[PDB]
Amino acid sequence: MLMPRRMKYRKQQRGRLKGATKGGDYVAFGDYGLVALEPAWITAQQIEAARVAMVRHFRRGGKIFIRIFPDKPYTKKPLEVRMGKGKGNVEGYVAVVKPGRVMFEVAGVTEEQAMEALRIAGHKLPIKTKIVRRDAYDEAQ
Amino acid sequence: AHKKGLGSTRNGRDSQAKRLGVKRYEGQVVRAGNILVRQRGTRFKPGKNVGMGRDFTLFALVDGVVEFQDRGRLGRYVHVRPLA
Amino acid sequence: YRLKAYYREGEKPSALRRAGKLPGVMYNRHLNRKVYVDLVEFDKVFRQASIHHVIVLELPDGQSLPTLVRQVNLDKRRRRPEHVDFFVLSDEPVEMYVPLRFVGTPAGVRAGGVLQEIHRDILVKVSPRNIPEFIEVDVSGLEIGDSLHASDLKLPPGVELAVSPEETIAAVVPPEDVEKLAEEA
Amino acid sequence: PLDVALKRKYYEEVRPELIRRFGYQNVWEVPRLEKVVINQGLGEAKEDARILEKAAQELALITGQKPAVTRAKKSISNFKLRKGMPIGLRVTLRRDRMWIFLEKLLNVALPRIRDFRGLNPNSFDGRGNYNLGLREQLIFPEITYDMVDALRGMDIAVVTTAETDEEARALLELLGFPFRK
Amino acid sequence: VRIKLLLECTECKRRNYATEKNKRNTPNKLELRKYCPWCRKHTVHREVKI
Amino acid sequence: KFRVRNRIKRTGRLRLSVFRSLKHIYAQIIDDEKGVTLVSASSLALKLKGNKTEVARQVGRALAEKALALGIKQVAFDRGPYKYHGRVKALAEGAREGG
Amino acid sequence: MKEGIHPKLVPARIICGCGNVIETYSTKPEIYVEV
RNA sequence: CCACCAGCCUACCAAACCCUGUCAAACUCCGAAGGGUCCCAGGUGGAGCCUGGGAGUGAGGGCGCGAGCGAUAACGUCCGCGU
RNA sequence: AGAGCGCAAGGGUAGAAGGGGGCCUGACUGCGAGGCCUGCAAGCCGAGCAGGGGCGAAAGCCGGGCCUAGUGAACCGGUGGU
RNA sequence: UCCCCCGUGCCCAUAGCGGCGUGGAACCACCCGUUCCCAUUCCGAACACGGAAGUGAAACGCGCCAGCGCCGAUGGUACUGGGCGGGCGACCGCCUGGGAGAGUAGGUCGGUGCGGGGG
């Protein structure tokens, strides 16, 4: 989780999400990484779920970084209502993530550690991902 | 069915869009009293027989044809030059 | 080390790509022809390179010339190289990223702690007569909270610097556990 | 010209010491005196009219000139006064006028200050400027008890063509400014 | 609003007209502004009536 | 610092681009657009006299004739820091009609 | 300084506590103080 | 731990700034594809212009992509270009 | 140019629209070329012309306000005049 | 024909900053006097009116440097007319033409006409 505590617009329109990551597939941080495969929102609930499952499995572990950040307002209408009359509610605080975007990375772990960890952490999220090392990513800032 | 407490709004209010834009360009004869630039701030500064009014609007003073100009450390220019 | 090269003509990349050749451009001072290589040995060799090591491209033109890399645009989608830039070398003081090899196991390290990999690759002005290989970086006496930066690093006699030097090249950071489940609060 | 005591001495004494020790092989770059403004801005002009500025003009009356009631700038709720027209008493002194100013100053003004320990040395701007305040208005010669209300200090400002510490400092010591230590 | 209200000035030397507005709230005692009538050049003008 | 183009409030029509400086008075009359000038008259930069105010007088009137040789009738005294103390040559009698 | 209602000038002395005799030129005619 | 006033220290909080990446309909340094309109040119078609009598028509719907809304549900509704 | 530019924000502005002083009163009169806009109606822009008026040494600006909100056709009747 | 400067204007920062070197013989600028013209919500600073001695630092004019600042090719890609499949959608692919900024190379502290004086 995490988000602004006071931004600019309570509500904002859904939008269209096709692809291209916009920017963010290299590193400069971790030594292993987890990268998305589909153009969807990732919910901060799921995000912190991953953060958990991660630091959870590997206790006393080093530092993990989240390149993403859940800053998209979901419009959730009250339950059992009728059409029109308004909109949703500032629920589902999430982020816009497209394939090829490094959601999150580990550094200081172990090989199989980072493996199983990021493996499960990714298995949590509403998609599927790529577990990546660090070599080609070099340069691009 | 059961439809409990819902609500309302406050935003069903819009400003009547007023047709704004530039009407005449280089290549068109404009003869004395023809508006050719609708704007709010100085998007287009007047000049050579060009005119401005009480609301930043460019028009024709002569029976001349429009043309443009760029002067960075001054602004954007329109010059409606006629014939010798 | 060694790698093949061939002159690009101007044929649309789409084909060159879809076959097996990796398209790219090379240049020096004013020269700017177009070229291409071959993914597999290109990939394999580049691992033993980047802007850390020097490369050589032999060409069926009668001339074999070495370059360094630079700017690598990618596919984003499905993640992999799809274009490369190669700056032809010289002997006149050039600027690029020398690797910093982390060395030292102090108090930040060992007693928990994780190194802050900021700048392995750092902007330096070295004469292409000299070639700094693996600039050592002293970690031998650092503790969590602190860092290391500036001229503290190794400045080989044939290499000059020009970044800040302020820029923290590395630091040590605190680990995590179930104590952030207390933060969960 | 208006020959006072420290003026004639500046003419003469300044050239030997300044040119010999500091070394200034330029007849006109040589950074000497400059503008000396006196400023007594309060903030108590919440109102009380210019019966409160009448006090402010009495100040300029002592320097031998008439002032301008420069003022504030913004809306301050805390100590009242918004917009920006209260009390920021100011006058501009130059050449032969500031001459008589500092004249009366180091001649007779300064010694009766009560905590006249030593002219504060740590108030250097560093570009040929020197800024300081004071605790009593009557420390200067001309004004005696027959006008005083309670307390009305002054923030003296003296810019100099100088640019560094040493030159303007010893300029103050060649125009009589007895520092702390 | 009436506080600013609406009043009309008239020339002296018989009648004449021109239309205006006031501000009684603002220090507006009486008005004798200088304008031009239908007949002849610019002259006097006095304020009167609603 | 006196720009404002007072020359824009002189873009009205026909210019007299000048400037005053310590020793010389640069009284010039300029055809604009192409910025092609015409009529110059100066202090001792015209080799006339040494006091700007007297020079002015004489110069303007000398300048008058110059203007009146090239079919010149009216322009506008050009300066932002002008202040206008006249220098009652004020290029008014000096050809222009001026004031 | 110019104007007109300016508080004027005129010389002033100094009959200090030591016997000092300084010659000043400020605003009030009778200036004298301490040292 | 002192006063004429300062020192000093931290796996604390944080103004700002530098770097590391980063996000945006109501952010915009750059800015297309495109549309728009004048100028010259071709284009003979139930093109077009101009005045004049007769209408009807004003619940429309689907698919197509581009946006809203819905839950990036609806053989859902809401607009736009396209049929 | 992040200040301010009455009020909401947009656009705009320090080569002024902002802020200081002096004379004033063009929130002028009789007309309006030709254009914005558009179902009608209403709204928007203004050259020039002539009467005279204010400031400007002049060249010259002035038919209210930096603009977009502050509005109500007609029928009825009040009131002063022709 | 051109050299140095002054008045000036055009390009719109590759024209700007900063560091630096140089000129006062005509100039420019400080300077100089504050009686006269004249003005400052206060200042002869500013605008001035009258100008001998001096100065070339500051004002500026010319020169050298890129550190900052501005420009930015060329490869490739984004997105896209128009055409055509594939997927339950979320969405992906191909041709035809159109073609960015991101950045790398590298560029750049100037370009220039009217008028005036001295040589």
Curated annotation (Swiss-Prot), chain A:
Protein's UniProt keywords contain Flavoprotein: no
Keyword NADP recorded: no
PANTHER family: 50S/60S RIBOSOMAL PROTEIN L16, LARGE RIBOSOMAL SUBUNIT PROTEIN UL16M
A GO term for molecular function: rRNA binding
UniProt organism field: Thermus thermophilus (strain ATCC BAA-163 / DSM 7039 / HB27)
Keywords: Ribonucleoprotein, Ribosomal protein, RNA-binding, rRNA-binding, tRNA-binding
Gene: rplP
Record text on subunit structure and interactions: Part of the 50S ribosomal subunit.
Function: Binds 23S rRNA and is also seen to make contacts with the A and possibly P site tRNAs.
Protein name, entry field: Large ribosomal subunit protein uL16
GO biological-process terms attached to the record: translation
Gene Ontology CC annotations of this record: cytosolic large ribosomal subunit
InterPro entries: Ribosomal_uL16, Ribosomal_uL16_bact-type, Ribosomal_uL16_dom, Ribosomal_uL16_sf
Protein family per UniProt: Belongs to the universal ribosomal protein uL16 family.
Swiss-Prot record, chain B:
Gene3D superfamilies given in the database record: 2.40.50.100
Keyword Ribonucleoprotein attributed: yes
Protein name: Large ribosomal subunit protein bL27
Taxonomic lineage from the root: Bacteria, Thermotogati, Deinococcota, Deinococci, Thermales
Database matches in Pfam families: Ribosomal_L27
InterPro entries named among the record's database cross-references: Ribosomal_bL27, Ribosomal_bL27_CS
Family per similarity comment: Belongs to the bacterial ribosomal protein bL27 family.
Disordered: region residues: 1-20
HAMAP family: Ribosomal_bL27
Keyword Ribonucleoprotein among record annotations: yes
GO cellular component labels: cytosolic large ribosomal subunit
GO process annotations (BP): translation
UniProtKB/Swiss-Prot annotation, chain E:
Lineage top rank: taxon: Bacteria
Ribonucleoprotein found in the keyword field: yes
InterPro entries referenced in this protein's UniProt entry, alphabetically: Ribosomal_bL33, Ribosomal_bL33_CS, Ribosomal_bL33_sf, Ribosomal_zn-bd
GO MF annotation list: structural constituent of ribosome
GO biological process, one term: translation
Gene Ontology cellular-component terms listed: cytoplasm; ribonucleoprotein complex; ribosome
Pfam entry (one): Ribosomal_L33
Classification via PANTHER family: 50S RIBOSOMAL PROTEIN L33, CHLOROPLASTIC (PTHR43168), LARGE RIBOSOMAL SUBUNIT PROTEIN BL33C (PTHR43168:SF2)
Family: Belongs to the bacterial ribosomal protein bL33 family.
Name assigned to this protein: Large ribosomal subunit protein bL33
From Swiss-Prot, chain G:
Residues the entry annotates as binding Zn(2+): 16, 18
Complex and partners: Part of the 50S ribosomal subunit.
Record family assignment: Belongs to the bacterial ribosomal protein bL31 family. Type A subfamily.
Role summary: Binds the 23S rRNA.
Name of the protein described by the UniProt record: Large ribosomal subunit protein bL31
Lineage: Bacteria, Thermotogati, Deinococcota, Deinococci, Thermales
Residues of the full protein shown: 1 to 35 of 71
